[PDB]
Amino acid sequence: SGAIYVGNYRVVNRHLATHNDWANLVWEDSSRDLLVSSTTAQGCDTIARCDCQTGVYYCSSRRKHYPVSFSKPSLIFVEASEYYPARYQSHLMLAVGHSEPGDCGGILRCQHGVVGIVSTGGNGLVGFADVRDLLWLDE
């Protein structure tokens, strides 16, 4: 579990969105596993606007942060789950690092701010849904 709080927006993994997130829907994209909802209180997370390929992510299944080198956002095949059929997930970045079911929503950050959130994983890998291209989050 986990979310990004920036301005009047809450960014979560689309498959973990609540009834409240859907009732205050701003934008969602199944192909990216992202959903953004509106908030009443101001959020103070800063979004990175960069092309960093190194950062640090929070791994809830270890209660620890880990440094990672990650690939540029791309279209990656993701096996079927209870949430989605087998499909290509876009704007996904892979890294070597621990992740297990339950870790989605952990924040990935570089020196510039929030890069994305955990969205996939498996066999010593972790995948992050990029949010750096969503320029409207800051307005």
Ligand SMILES: CCc1ccccc1CC(=O)N1CCC[C@H](C(N)=O)C1
């Ligand atoms: C960190 C998650 C994980 C780690 C290690 C093994 C398995 C998983 C679960 C997994 O990758 N998925 C289930 C939930 C929806 C995800 C999606 N974005 O399509 C895919």
Ligand SMILES: [Zn+2]
């Ligand atoms: Zn950066």
